[PDB]
Amino acid sequence: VLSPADKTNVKAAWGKVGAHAGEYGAEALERMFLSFPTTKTYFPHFDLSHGSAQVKGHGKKVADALTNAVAHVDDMPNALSALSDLHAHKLRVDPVNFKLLSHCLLVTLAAHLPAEFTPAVHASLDKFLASVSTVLTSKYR
Amino acid sequence: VLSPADKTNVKAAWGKVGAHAGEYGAEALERMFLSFPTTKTYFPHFDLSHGSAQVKGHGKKVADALTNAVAHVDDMPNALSALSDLHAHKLRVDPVNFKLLSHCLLVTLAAHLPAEFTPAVHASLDKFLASVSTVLTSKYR
Amino acid sequence: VHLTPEEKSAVTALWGKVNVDEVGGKALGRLLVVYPWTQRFFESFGDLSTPDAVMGNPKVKAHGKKVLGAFSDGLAHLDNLKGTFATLSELHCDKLHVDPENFRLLGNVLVCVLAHHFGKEFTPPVQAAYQKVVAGVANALAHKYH
Amino acid sequence: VHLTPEEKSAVTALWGKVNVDEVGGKALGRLLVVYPWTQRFFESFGDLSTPDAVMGNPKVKAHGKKVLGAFSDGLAHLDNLKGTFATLSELHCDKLHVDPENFRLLGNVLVCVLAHHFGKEFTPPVQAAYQKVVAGVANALAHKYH
Ligand code: HEM
Ligand code: HEM
Ligand code: HEM
Ligand code: HEM
């Protein structure tokens, strides 16, 4: 479960991300395509080159989903409901890829949060992103 | 989660395990140890020789906990609460190993329950064991 | 893939009893049922609407065959998996876009099918040998991804 | 493993900036805080019951500097990571009974620490290089398990 210290650390962290959420989303996506080339198999229609507006626009949407979830941390399965269907019933990305995106979101937050990304906050953000990953794959079968 | 149908399938199949609990548990553990040697890292305090009394006893306890889980399928986190405390606080087995034992449990059931192990039943059991694994790791952090 | 000589022996002995449209068809069909997201590659097949539907699909069967045939030939090359699957690894990445995690899932299903089909004959040591084989194959098919 | 010139260059250059001692403590500490079940191996280090306890523990810092020191030594042998870590591999299997999944977790935490410390200089491309290195080291330290 996400603890009250987790929710606090997550809100403080994401609160510090501010208007850069969208930007960190695309960066997280680039990191993932470079570090873990298999994830590119889900984006055969995208230009995945550095600077790609497709990657940037997709990053904005990912970052925005993570925003709603923070805004609604106490009831994330509701906040994210529309979105787990989309992955469970259409996109059908294998669950293993969510850990890879999560790790790459954490690396992006670490790279932009010199003061905020303490061990305790790192710990809470990893649990938060696993929680989001679990909601997003909860209707898969 | 588990549908009425997965619950029906799990009860039906596990019911046929019946008095073979220790035998099938011990078998699954043995499958795990030979197929995935890294799992032996959790049992350096066992004689893992073929036939060993320690493997047979632990097999029994693992299968009995799963019968517990089947028998309380509409309330597994409570039914499993002591065991989840134990793996979270003491044993601290990395969550990946639960996939490996669950696979070996499916294999054992396949090898022993030719009639019961249909594709649908294989699916409900795989979901059930993942559910068990989730409850058993729910207090890890 | 570091199989022992007798492990290789066990795999081959057992594999001699396998019919493949049956076994290939059975492994691919169960993949699509237990891990339904793998069907994503399968819009074309129409009814994959139920388990019986998937298992009986002639399409699934023909593809099972194609897949296990390739897998069968790899048993002749157990010291050359990356080699024998390279140009196949490139196809699966560049054109088919199949996430290599699907290869790992098929491998575990193939093991489950083999246990189901051979019963007691599918002993723990036999399983362990096959687990190395399916890991080696998945790793070989994933190897040319980029 | 295999790194492009770009990748090897990024790995070497970043590591020139790395105070291995400090980065070790931080990476091991973070491992114990983020994945607390990893504490099962460090019972004799004493109190590890809060993030502040772990990050202020001197045996954790000391050990971190030994771990990352051995990691460092490995960066000079990127083309034979198995031979370089074989001993350590054996030690971790036979004496310490450490599940190799722990190595993957440390690599992911090590990546987070380098990102945190170096900020924008830890670019996606530099990350990709390090990801290949840490997965190499882990497969190397897992290689002699049996
Ligand atoms: C943190 C976890 C994730 C979140 C929060 C997330 C969120 C989203 C959102 C918000 C969209 C667009 C929804 C819309 O169009 O209204 C989307 C689409 C998509 N996602 Fe996910 N996603 C996650 C993980 C993943 C992963 C790991 C993959 C594959 C590696 C993936 C593959 C896709 C694809 C292929 C699309 C459709 C993109 C397009 O063609 O426009 N997602 N996701
Ligand atoms: C289906 C998943 C699992 C179930 C149902 C299960 C159940 C149990 C049970 C009932 C016990 C005995 C606790 C007692 O004494 O009351 C136990 C202990 C233990 N389990 Fe788990 N477990 C599971 C997964 C795992 C996995 C995946 C591992 C590691 C590969 C593991 C490692 C251990 C260890 C080392 C002990 C203590 C053994 C001893 O010294 O007696 N468990 N487990
Ligand atoms: C056991 C590992 C596998 C092996 C050895 C294998 C082998 C092959 C071979 C030999 C072909 C011939 C393709 C052609 O040129 O017509 C093929 C095609 C194909 N494979 Fe794989 N395959 C494997 C796993 C998978 C999995 C798990 C999936 C998806 C879940 C998949 C998706 C496909 C698709 C979509 C084609 C093209 C089929 C067509 O267009 O008719 N493969 N495979
Ligand atoms: C992945 C890179 C790692 C490297 C290169 C590494 C290296 C080392 C080194 C150099 C030693 C000192 C032993 C000696 O030669 O005298 C050590 C000991 C040890 N290692 Fe690892 N290590 C790694 C990861 C891990 C992880 C992830 C864990 C567990 C979570 C772990 C558990 C231990 C333990 C428990 C000791 C004994 C500490 C003591 O003396 O009480 N190691 N390792």
Swiss-Prot record, chains A, B:
Changing H87R: In Iwata; unstable. Changing G18D: In Al-Ain Abu Dhabi. Transmembrane segments: none annotated. Changing R92W: In Cemenelum; O(2) affinity up. Heme b binds at H87. The modification N6-succinyllysine is found at K7, K11, K16, K40. Changing N9T: In Broomfield. Changing R31S: In Prato; unstable. The modification N6-acetyllysine is found at K16. Changing E27V: In Spanish town. Changing D47G: In Kokura; also in Umi/Michigan; unstable. Changing A12D: In J-Paris 1/J-Aljezur. Changing A53D: In J-Rovigo; unstable. Gene3D superfamilies: Globins. GO terms for cellular component: blood microparticle; cytosol; endocytic vesicle lumen; extracellular exosome; extracellular region; extracellular space; haptoglobin-hemoglobin complex; hemoglobin complex. Involved in oxygen transport from the lung to the various peripheral tissues. This is Hemoglobin subunit alpha. The lineage of its organism: Eukaryota, Metazoa, Chordata, Craniata, Vertebrata. The gene is HBA1.
Curated annotation (Swiss-Prot), chains C, D:
This is Hemoglobin subunit beta. Changing H116L: In Vexin; increased oxygen affinity. Changing V111A: In Stanmore; O(2) affinity down; unstable. Changing E43Q: In Hoshida/Chaya. It comes from Homo sapiens (Human). Changing A138P: In Brockton; unstable. Glycans are attached at V1, K8, K17, K66, K120, K144. The modification S-nitrosocysteine is found at C93. Residues 2-146 form the Globin domain.
